[PDB]
Amino acid sequence: RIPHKNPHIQKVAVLQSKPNKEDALNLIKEIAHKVSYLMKENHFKVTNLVEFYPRDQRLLGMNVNHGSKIMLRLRCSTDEFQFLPMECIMGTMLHELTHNLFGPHDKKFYNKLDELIGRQWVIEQRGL
Ligand SMILES: [Zn+2]
C-alpha cells in the first residue's frame, strides 16, 4: 500500500538512480504518514521532504528555509543498498522538524526536540 498522505507535507521525492528506489519511496512516505499527527499538533508545514545521500558521511538530514525543504538520508553511508533503521530516520526527521522553529543547537532546540521525540512515541503507540 501507499501510505496515507500527510496534509502538511506537499511533496516527497527519493533518489531515482539508487537501488530499490521503490522501497525508498515507500519508506519516506511512511515517515511522512507517521509524523502527520505531530505536525498537525505543532502547526508544522513542509513543502518538500526528499532523500539525499551526501559524500559527507556524518550528514543525516538538513532543513532548508525552515521547512521549505527537509532532506533525509535513508541509506547507510557505507552501503547504498542498505536502508537505515526506521527509528534512526524518524529521529532525524524530528531533529529537522525542530529546525522549522529553532536554528542553533541550543537549549530551545534540544528542549523542543526532546518534547517531539517523547510525543511521537505516544502518538505511534496509540496509532493516532
Ligand atoms: Zn540540527
Side-chain angles (χ1 to χ4, degrees), residues 1-57 59-128:
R1 282 109 185 98
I2 301 180
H4 283 97
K5 301 180 190 186
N6 179 344
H8 315 292
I9 303 173
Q10 293 179 51
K11 181 79 160 63
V12 305
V14 299
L15 293 168
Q16 290 303 299
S17 54
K18 296 297 173 183
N20 302 114
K21 73 184 186 179
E22 300 81 11
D23 283 351
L25 186 59
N26 173 262
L27 180 53
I28 203 166
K29 287 187 178 189
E30 184 63 20
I31 294 284
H33 173 56
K34 282 180 107 188
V35 293
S36 61
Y37 196 93
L38 183 69
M39 290 183 68
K40 178 172 211 60
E41 282 191 344
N42 289 276
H43 317 302
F44 290 155
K45 295 290 186 177
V46 173
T47 301
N48 297 289
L49 174 60
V50 301
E51 176 185 18
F52 74 153
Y53 193 71
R55 276 294 287 179
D56 182 351
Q57 299 186 25
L59 198 42
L60 294 181
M62 189 168 296
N63 183 324
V64 177
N65 287 317
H66 312 288
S68 187
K69 187 185 293 177
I70 284 176
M71 297 174 286
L72 296 178
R73 180 190 289 276
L74 301 182
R75 298 164 187 272
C76 276
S77 60
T78 59
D79 179 15
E80 287 182 352
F81 288 89
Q82 187 131 253
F83 291 110
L84 301 175
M86 174 83 83
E87 316 90 78
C88 288
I89 303 172
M90 177 59 50
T92 295
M93 180 63 177
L94 298 180
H95 180 115
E96 302 303 334
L97 283 171
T98 303
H99 283 313
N100 278 28
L101 292 173
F102 305 123
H105 294 137
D106 54 18
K107 282 185 179 185
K108 290 172 299 200
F109 176 90
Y110 284 111
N111 176 65
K112 179 67 186 184
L113 171 55
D114 173 77
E115 293 297 319
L116 296 176
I117 288 167
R119 177 57 176 161
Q120 177 63 20
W121 169 267
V122 174
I123 289 169
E124 292 183 17
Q125 219 187 23
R126 306 198 187 189
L128 305 183

